[PDB]
């Protein structure tokens, strides 16, 4: 089987957990692992190449308690370093979050999330959201909530992890019904935002 070790990190409270949450089956098919403080959630997509298994690592909460231990991350293939747009302090830690995930990792391929962009007052705006310019990175804006964006940084990273760009996703998974449903008008800014932001 096509499978990658996912790491999700970032700060407590991002929503890390709500976001791995929208794969139904990966949630239903989840295995705690009892060293860890971990859940691994099998994330499967279907892409025009065949089946690839993210297998997310989602913390038990211990980030609340300061950067996770380091078997956490090994042997990881790729990672989502999720911040809270509604919050800036989740944002000016992501260069850490990236640091220790390099520091034990080296250049795995890892996509940024700003997750929250349901929330009519957000805090951190496209413009302010450079670091994945920096360090090579991609970045989207989700909200786990309403399903926005759900399948961006997978696409992206299977396209990364396998080697081909025109890779397509040819279903896609199960997802818990949106709990709050992202303002279109919202959308449409955002995606605004953005492209003005890259040029
Ligand atoms: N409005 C909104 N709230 C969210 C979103 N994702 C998570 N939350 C809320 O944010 C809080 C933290 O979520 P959680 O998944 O536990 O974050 P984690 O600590 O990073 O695992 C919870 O109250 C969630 O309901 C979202 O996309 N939009
Ligand atoms: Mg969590």
Known sequence: QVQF??????????????????????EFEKKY?????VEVHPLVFHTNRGPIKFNVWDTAGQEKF???????????????IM???TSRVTYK??????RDLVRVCENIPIVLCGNKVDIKDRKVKAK???????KNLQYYDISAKSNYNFE??????????????????????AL???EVVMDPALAAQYEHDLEVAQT
Request: aromatic share 10%; with cysteine.
């Open 83 to 85: 911040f809270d747009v």
């Open 176 to 178: 818990a019904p949106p």
């Open 128 to 134: 302010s959201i450079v670091f994945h310019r920096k």
């Open 66 to 80: 300061g950067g996770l231990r380091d078997g956490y991350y090994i042997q990881a293939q790729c990672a989502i």
């Open 93 to 98: 830690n992501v260069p850490n979050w990236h």
């Open 152 to 173: 961006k940084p997978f696409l992206w990273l299977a396209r990364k992890l396998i080697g081909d760009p025109n890779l397509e996703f040819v279903a896609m998974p």
């Open 5 to 26: 070790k996912l790491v999700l990190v970032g700060d407590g409270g991002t929503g890390k957990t709500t976001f791995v949450k929208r794969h139904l089956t990966g």
């Open 33 to 37: 692992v009892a060293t860890l403080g």
